[PDB]
Structure 1
Amino acid sequence: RQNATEIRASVGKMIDGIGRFYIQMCTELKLSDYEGRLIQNSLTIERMVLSAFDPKKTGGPIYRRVDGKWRRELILYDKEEIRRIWRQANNGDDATAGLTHMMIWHSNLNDATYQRTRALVRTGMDPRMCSLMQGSTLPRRSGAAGAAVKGVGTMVMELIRMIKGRRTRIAYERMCNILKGKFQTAAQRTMVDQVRESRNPGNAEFEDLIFLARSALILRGSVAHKSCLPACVYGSAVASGYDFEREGYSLVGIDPFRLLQNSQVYSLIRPNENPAHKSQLVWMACHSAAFEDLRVSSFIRGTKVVPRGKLSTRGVQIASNENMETMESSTLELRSRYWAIRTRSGGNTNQQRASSGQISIQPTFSVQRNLPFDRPTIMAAFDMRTEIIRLMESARPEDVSFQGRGVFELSDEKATSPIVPSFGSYFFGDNAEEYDN
């Protein structure tokens, strides 16, 4: 209760700083309120402050509504001027947390937009491990929030890139310990110790990490999920009279759903693009939901969340070689029917629950039919690698996680009355090579 109030205070301070920074940048650039709430403008401004910290100038495309048409202009700012605007919006401090928050939003968007199969094959990883690749476009030396948000496969990928002096060993051991904390079984954690304790890591460590990544498809790791929104949402809220420091804020509770319910974000739309599909993409990004079950996402949103291959849309960002005369703008539908708490858990990994159910029928009636039985489960019952294999063999796609937990009405602020839903799952399952759904 008091610990939550304290967390909400610091998060609320962070969000307030991003908001004031964005308001300042909008006034500097003389953008209208609508233009300030165009997501492409928000991404440019976010990129500029990140570039300023992460000639000595930074910039990008800024889009204005001029004479009934959308116009693109490349603006340039001194990196030192941007740094001063950020620091002073955050009351003198560097506020690295706000920067990392915007990085995670960018990361969550990239996770929803692009598949990193090229990066995966380069590191010797299965391109089908995408659900483990949360935060893979984040830098290696990210923040505490960045490390928490990164998937098991992202950590594996970064660790193999290390394998392929004194500061290199500390970085290697730190990343092993980050990965270890994500694993929910002792057997997986022990294998990470065996990789961490390796003097001169090589092929044996590579193989162990690939093994661990594949185990995390079934024995999933604890990855944090944070709803991180474009800076324009925070800026527009601060400007309109919302005080994030007095109200507090949460990345995992109702707050971001309530905030999106009271916001209006815009997007540039290419010809032949569906705005609803652009909306779905950004909504998924907003709630870090790229690798979620599409059934869960659909039920929360209230409209079908379709696979990536069914979306009639390209990326949010507009390339510099694209024609602006064919560009239209529309509202992004970023609201939801319900809301749900964002989890750090990877679900159940305990295979010794002595779980109750039914995996066969016994015929009562003399009637022609096939006799259903759960083959893989029945047949499954017949050092650390072999234990992990056995734990994976015990697991079933049917096994239920998050028991008793449900979605909530937007009016249910205290999360008192959970709605447990009656349950195509893979967002990246629909491509020209695989029909995984």
Structure 2
Amino acid sequence: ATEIRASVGKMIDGIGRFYIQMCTELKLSDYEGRLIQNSLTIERMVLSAFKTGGPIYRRVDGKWRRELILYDKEEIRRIWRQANNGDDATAGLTHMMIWHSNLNDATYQRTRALVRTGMDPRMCSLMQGSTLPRRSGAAGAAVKGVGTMVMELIRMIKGRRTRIAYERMCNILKGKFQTAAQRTMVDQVRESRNPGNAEFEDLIFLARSALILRGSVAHKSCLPACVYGSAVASGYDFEREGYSLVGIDPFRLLQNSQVYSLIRPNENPAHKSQLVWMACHSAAFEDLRVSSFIRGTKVVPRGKLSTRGVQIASNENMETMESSTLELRSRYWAIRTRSGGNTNQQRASSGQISIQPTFSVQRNLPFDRPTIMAAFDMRTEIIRLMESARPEDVSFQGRGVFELSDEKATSPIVPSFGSYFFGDNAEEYD
């Protein structure tokens, strides 16, 4: 833990130094450096560099102005290396990629990507890290959802290093499934010589199972580079303090941070705030109920957000742009989890699925129909398993949210309970 906190704090420190350096090169004010659109452009440059450029926004003469600068790719690479104490440091790079992936996840639905690959467009929750490149980092591999892995594999199905890349990806997906039966199917997908339709069909099946028997997907709170640099500049030593991507650290950092965004005339700044908050804590596919309780204000479904994407296209004019503070804080914090919830065990149940009438009174007599009726090789075993599962089944027993004053996470608050972010659109009301 101390050693993990050490190396994590080391990469965040590197990103920080880089960002400050990059902010001096462009002679940006501290406020301008803390504009999310400027941070993304800087982030994109160091990612693309591994000439390059993008739009950079300045507060000139009372109005927001856009400049499209350029840098030699060799120069950026040198700047990144030297901010990371000589080392090539690919970890900090993929950390900024996962941040970008989390924002993509929160902003865009990729139904067009899903349909081309023959997948159901209702597989959002499975699609964490879909915009993330194939053969990403180890952290990138961990952060990718089950569906992302299924999608990547079908693209493979549609030069014997192709074989190892196919088997590596099969194993990534396998390590994510929490039931042996799901894992055993992945073996049958992997053990195939010349994979094709049977494997394709198997992978579509596995993705569906992962909507109920959910896979183990990592979640890492990853913040815009401006947040880390800002902290480094202000006198915070991530190497001496350590740092965590799943503990209290990122919540505490945002609590001591102020990020800005360019805002269009039609846009609600609070709705922009929610979007970037969601992205920051990898919460695009979380239950809106828990996201809300944690944040302390309602986390509204995508379709009821009066906001477009963070990035301002070159198409639109800057004279109508204003700049707003992004509200990225929270009432509570909570540990980010690798788990997909309970899928295994099924040790008893303990509950009530019907009533026995005591009083002679006119009413309906409620009962849990799907559960009662439920009780009436590896493919059918999975069917039987997800037929047993209930939406009412509780996961993460005993685990709760925490006060921001609760550094060591000593006193869990268990919340007494609209769930789908991408559930509210012109085709479907979920």
Please report the TM-score for the alignment, with normalisation by the length of structure 1. 0.98
Distance 2:336 2:238 in 1: 20
Q: Deviations over 1:276-327 (max 9, x none)?
A: 0000000000000000000000000000000000000000000001110000
2:307 is equivalent to residue 313 of structure 1:
yes
CA distance in 2, matches of 1:410, 1:91: 33
1:181 has 2:175 as partner: yes
Unmatched tracts of structure 2, length 5 or more: none
The answer to whether the Cα contact below 8 Å between 1:253 and 1:340 also exists between their aligned partners in 2 is yes
Q: How far did residue 351 of structure 1 move?
A: 5.4
Aligned partners of 1:351 and 1:395 also within 8 Å: no
Contact kept? 1:152, 1:182, Cα under 8 Å: yes
> Matched residue of 1:315: which SS?
coil
Of all paired residues, the percent bearing the same amino acid is 100
Contact 1:108 1:286 in 2 (8 A): yes
**CA offset digits 1:352-388 (Å, max 9, x no partner):** 2211000000000000000000000000001000000
Question: Deviations along 1:155-182, whole A, 9 cap, x unmatched?
Answer: 0000000000211000000000000000
Q: State the Cα distance separating 1:423 from its structure 2 match.
A: 1.5
Instruction: Tell me if structure 2 keeps the 8 A contact 1:351–1:394.
Output: no
| Matched position secondary structure for 1:64 | strand
Judging changes above 3 Å, is the alpha-carbon distance between structure 1 residues 371 and 351 closer, same or farther for their aligned structure 2 residues?
Answer: farther
Q: How many angstroms apart in 1 are the aligned matches of 2:55 and 2:300?
A: 30
Alpha-carbon distance in 2 for matches of 1:389, 1:15: 44
TM superposition shift of 1:270: 0.2
CA RMSD of aligned residues (A): 0.4
Tell me, yes or no, if the aligned pair for 1:120 and 1:157 is still in contact at 8 Å.
Answer: yes
Unpaired segments of 5 or more residues in structure 1? none
Structure-2 separation of matches of 1:279 and 1:297 = 13
Measure the CA separation in 2 of the matches of 1:45 and 1:380.
54
Distance in 1, matches of 2:343 and 2:136, equals 28
Q: Does 1:432 align with 2:426?
A: yes
Identify which range, 218-227 or 342-351, moves more after superposition. 342-351
1:392 corresponds to 2:386: yes
Give the aligned partner of residue 111 of structure 1: 105
**Rounded Cα–Cα distance in structure 2 between residues aligned with 1:7 and 1:37:** 28
Q: Please give the alpha-carbon distance, in whole angstroms, between the structure 2 residues aligned to 1:143 and 1:170.
A: 16
Q: Distance in 2 between matches of 1:349 and 1:392?
A: 9
Q: How far apart are 1:240 and its partner, in Å?
A: 0.1
- Cα deviation per residue 1:107-135 (whole Å; 9 max; x = unaligned)? 00000000000000000000000110000
Number of equivalenced pairs: 430
* TM-score, normalised via structure 2 length: 1.00
Structure 2 SS opposite 1:199: coil
Other structure's SS at 1:182 match: coil
How far apart are residue 350 of structure 1 and its match? 1.8
- Does the CA contact (< 8 Å) of 1:351 and 1:391 recur in 2? no
Is the 8 Å Cα contact of residues 185 and 349 (structure 1) preserved in structure 2? Answer: yes
| Distance (Å, rounded) in 2 between the aligned partners of 1:342 and 1:49 | 27
Aligned position for 1:20 = 17
| 3-state SS of paired residue (2:56) | strand
Q: What SS is found at the alignment partner of 2:70?
A: strand
